[PDB]
Amino acid sequence: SMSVKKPKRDDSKDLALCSMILTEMETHEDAWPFLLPVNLKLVPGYKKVIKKPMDFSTIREKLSSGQYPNLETFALDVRLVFDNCETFNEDDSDIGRAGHNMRKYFEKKWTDTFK
């Protein structure tokens, strides 16, 4: 509350460390469904159904331009990519499996770097 604060966690490396995680996600062999925004002209149903599209190149641009206020808003966009994927793709599909794999890969790196 006013003039009452928990001890200050060092967040000075968070930007660099999110960048590193994101590089690892970009270079994973199962990243291909997620590298670029889904083409809303060429994929029927996507625009209407997925209210907030997100992809790794959009997260990279937001990160590089100071549009994440803190490490939690970064994680929320990464998770949005996978939540969107599950919304639109059957689990038993190459893309559906890719999303599950990448979400696991992310959540481990996230826990190991920050928890």
Domains recognised in the chain with CATH numbers: 1-115 (1.20.920.10)
Phi, psi of 48 (to 5 degrees): -70, -40
Instruction: Mention every residue, 6+ apart, whose C-beta is less than 8 A from residue 96.
Output: 85, 86, 89, 90
Non-local (6+) Cβ contacts of 86 within 8 A are: 96, 99
Contact criterion met (CB below 8 Å) for 34 and 96: no
| Angle between helix 56-64 and 71-88 (nearest 10) | 160
Do the Cβ atoms of 96 and 86 come closer than 8 Å? yes
Which residue bears the tokens 């994929």?
A: 43
Q: Measuring CA to CA, which residue among 83, 77, 115 is closest to residue 99?
A: 83
Identity (one letter) of the amino acid at 90? E
Q: Distance between CA 85 and CA 58 in Å, rounded? A: 15
Method: X-ray
